[PDB]
Design a protein around this ligand. Sequence first.
Ligand SMILES: Nc1ncnc2c1nc(Br)n2[C@H](O)[C@H](O)[C@H](O)CCOP(=O)(O)OP(=O)(O)OC[C@@H]1O[C@@H](O)[C@@H](O)[C@@H]1O
Ligand SMILES: Nc1ncnc2c1nc(Br)n2[C@H](O)[C@H](O)[C@H](O)CCOP(=O)(O)OP(=O)(O)OC[C@@H]1O[C@@H](O)[C@@H](O)[C@@H]1O
Lengths: 284, 19, 476, 88
Amino acid sequence: ISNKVDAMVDLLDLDGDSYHVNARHLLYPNCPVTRFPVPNEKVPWETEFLIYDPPFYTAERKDAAAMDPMGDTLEPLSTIQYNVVDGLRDRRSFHGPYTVQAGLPLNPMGRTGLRGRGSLSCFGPNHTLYPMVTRWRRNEDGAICRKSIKKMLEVLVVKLPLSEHWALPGGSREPGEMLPRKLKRILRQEHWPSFENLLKCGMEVYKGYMDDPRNTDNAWIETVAVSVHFQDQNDVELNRLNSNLHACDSGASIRWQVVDRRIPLYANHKTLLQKAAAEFGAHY
Amino acid sequence: ISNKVDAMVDLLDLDGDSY
Amino acid sequence: QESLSSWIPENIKKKECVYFVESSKLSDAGKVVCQCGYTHEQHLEEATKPHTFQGTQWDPKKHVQEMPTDAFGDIVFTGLSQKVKKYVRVSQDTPSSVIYHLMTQHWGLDVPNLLISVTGGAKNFNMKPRLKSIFRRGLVKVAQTTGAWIITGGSHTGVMKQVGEAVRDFSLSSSYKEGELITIGVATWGTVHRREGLIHPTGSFPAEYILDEDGQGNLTCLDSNHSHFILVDDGTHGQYGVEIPLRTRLEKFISEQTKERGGVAIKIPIVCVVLEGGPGTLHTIDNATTNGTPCVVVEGSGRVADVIAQVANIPVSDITISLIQQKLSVFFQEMFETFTESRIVEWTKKIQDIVRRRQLLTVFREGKDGQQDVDVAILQALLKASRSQDHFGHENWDHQLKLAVAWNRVDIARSEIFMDEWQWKPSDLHPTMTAALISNKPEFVKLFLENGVQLKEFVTWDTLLYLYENLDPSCL
Amino acid sequence: QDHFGHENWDHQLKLAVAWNRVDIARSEIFMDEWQWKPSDLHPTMTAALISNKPEFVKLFLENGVQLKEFVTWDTLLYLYENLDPSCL
Ligand SMILES: Nc1ncnc2c1nc(Br)n2[C@H](O)[C@H](O)[C@H](O)CCOP(=O)(O)OP(=O)(O)OC[C@@H]1O[C@@H](O)[C@@H](O)[C@@H]1O
Ligand SMILES: Nc1ncnc2c1nc(Br)n2[C@H](O)[C@H](O)[C@H](O)CCOP(=O)(O)OP(=O)(O)OC[C@@H]1O[C@@H](O)[C@@H](O)[C@@H]1O
């Protein structure tokens, strides 16, 4: 009775904008100077704004970038062929003709809050392609595995120990002729990856602007997403990649992964995978 | 008393067509 | 175990596909799948022979063959509890008399005073804790205090998973008679995950079974909290429309049976409950309601049940087809675009009928009004429909009283029966007074003696002779 | 937080057992996130027995861990090694 009356005494007594977000965080990575705060209200360039005073972003070594070293735009040594190919340094963007002012390429998405050289290699947009291998995760019988809502996709991901994060085997396309060699030289072989480049004809999931933390008001990153899919698991490209492995040279392990909401990847690097979920009816 | 308090705990917890 | 293994295979028989049609469609890296879908290059795994005349293609009649069942026994679900649960394997054409005889005599079950049926959708659903506890407590109390059968599906996903969950919740305490919530399960044998570890002829006694979720395709796994399983055969690998017809036939034949204990005979009442179904529940609810079963749809977390709850007391024919379309367009986001202009017509007609008869239809009103322990709500709807039945000679009164005495709930007797319907001359309660005395029911004898039956009468020479004949058959 | 191999379940249960509040375990952990095959609770059952937590051992034994199993030769050897270090 005493215990029953106490809870009863207690009872009587008690009675979304889509603009880039990661690129706008404070404390630019590995840079002592903090980027000036830009709210979401005035992030676009066209929007009214009157207090603009960001420190000139300076890379640690802008000279070795093989592009314009001009962290400060006092001397416009750079001659960028806007909307045209400039040879070694690409100046053609997937988004389209962006606004140009004072010789500094303006970020099409908006004002990130920091303008300068940036961690990106080249002054202005930097092109990249992120390849992804997607197959349906299979049970012991080999049939497609079901969650409650939809299929499971099985995706191969690679991390290096220093990153403490997982990312797709993609990198900046240093060679114009053959991107995959530099993109995943520590993964395939370059011989098995010469074969992979011969087989490099898949399905184009996403192409356009990418939200990246390095994005300054001058340099931004746009990505290309290619997805090769496996229908059966008896033979072909699966065994071709199994024998097509020289990743044992260095680095950490290369591993297949399931597609899930809590899968450890970079914040918006996994937005590419989320878009790829629509390719084959994936449950996130 | 124990039986009387239980119903009281329950009380406090609960609260043309013609075709 | 000696006379049981004999009374199974030479009367019960299983369907098989004798003919050897090749694979018209090969799916999921498999060529053995041929129309019906078992292994081997042929349609089935039988002898690869011309199989009489080599007539092109097969007919579910010409090329389905019935041969004696080879799978039966006591399934044990590995380390998940040591309870040993019976299972049998049947086909389309087995008369309900055979299954009733097996289940009553050989399996050891007792004839119930009520048949509560649990039919619901199979898309997994998650529901609020209040309604969750209410449903569990109500189902367990109504199915334990009356000794009723809880016939339902055998899968491990959905409403039947919820009732397995509630049976587990009962076994958590199990104040007395732990193995008394017998829940026979009905499911298709052709869609079971680890069913190849159960095919053992002339007795698969303790045949261990392993359950593994997220390791199947579209097929289904067995439950672990049910007490009995009856699996049906069609000689098919991936169809889901074979258990419902047989279940309806058997459930209809059960209610035909009459129970006679103590001198009063009643036909077993039959009630139905639903929870967020899909397209086939508008079969089961209609098929149940047209007969006269008190279907009990619950308001809350419903794809289908909530639709009836929403359109429930709104009067008949006041709803338009466009109104029903806009009602349906606010609840079915996943397939709101795959709904044909003809899919609306079926649902409109069936909702029209179900909601038109509000005497049989009953909405739960989870917490608004009548939010009792569910047991009395189900009993109240059942007695509502029993009151709605035909009666010419003051039979409703006596039948309802007999049924209340057959159960063991005096609150129902005093708050529904004994309060209403007038008349009830004290001599009228004599026939059920005998059963109440025989079955040792002191509450009901007190209530009857309150209403006017005099112990000075009702003790006749004939009545005393009857009572001494039915004396407790365990006494010195 | 990140979890690839059903680690959230085990981590939350380990943390609840590390604390001494069974209400949290039953109202947040043990009610949700599905699955939890009775063999999964064995690693934390050992810690619950070692640290003298009767409420958690009752709750685990309610969920399905059978005392017929989980007493292995290795498990018994482990338990006797971690016996209360203040005993005769
Ligand atoms: N979705 C992302 N993609 C690339 N970077 C990202 C991403 N998210 C973040 Br936040 N970051 C930042 O880079 C991290 O903060 C690291 O501190 C930065 C580099 O250090 P790491 O983590 O060691 O290397 P990665 O990030 O894996 O790739 C970098 C490659 O290597 C360089 O030479 C460059 O040419 C290539 O972009
Ligand atoms: N054990 C199962 N039974 C029926 N279907 C099942 C089962 N397991 C799975 Br896997 N599925 C599949 O899902 C079906 O293809 C559903 O279409 C899929 C979505 O489920 P629902 O559409 O929500 O539910 P219904 O289609 O209306 O069938 C209600 C039935 O009728 C009652 O008598 C009971 O025998 C059943 O509950």
